[PDB]
């Protein structure tokens, strides 16, 4: 199933954004390079919110279809919820 057969919803759900911010801010707190030009923060969770609004989180969500298949959506491909 290529990008033609890409059948899940284009909107990033609340669960996907809730886990993406968590595991991105956990990486930022473990001294990952930050993708965005931060204006000065110490909270990694606020920096991950900056990267989520910048659509620059380097994470692909593997959405498991219930038959066994899986799609791979980029965060920048997903329309953010808010």
């Amino acid at each position: 199933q290529a990008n033609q057969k890409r059948i899940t919803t284009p909107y990033m759900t609340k669960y996907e954004r809730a886990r993406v911010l968590g595991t991105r801010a956990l990486q930022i707190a473990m001294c990952a390079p930050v993708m965005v030009e931060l204006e000065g923060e110490t909270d990694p969770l606020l920096i991950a919110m900056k990267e989520l609004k910048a659509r620059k989180i380097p994470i692909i969500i593997r959405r498991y279809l219930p038959d066994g298949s899986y799609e791979d959506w980029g965060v920048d491909e997903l329309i953010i919820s808010d």
Partner: protein, 62 residues
Amino acid sequence: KHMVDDKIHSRARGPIQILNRQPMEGRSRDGGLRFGEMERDCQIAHGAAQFLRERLFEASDP
């Protein structure tokens, strides 16, 4: 008779039972609160499966 100094307690990785390695019961033995079945159901309803893993596995008895 119900005073708030008699009822306040917190807990963080204190004494642990010997039969299973879960925290103690009651504030007199520095025990922790019970994260019962209905809270497990409520955190299923939130969909906080990482918080539910953190409660039921990591911050209780890893």
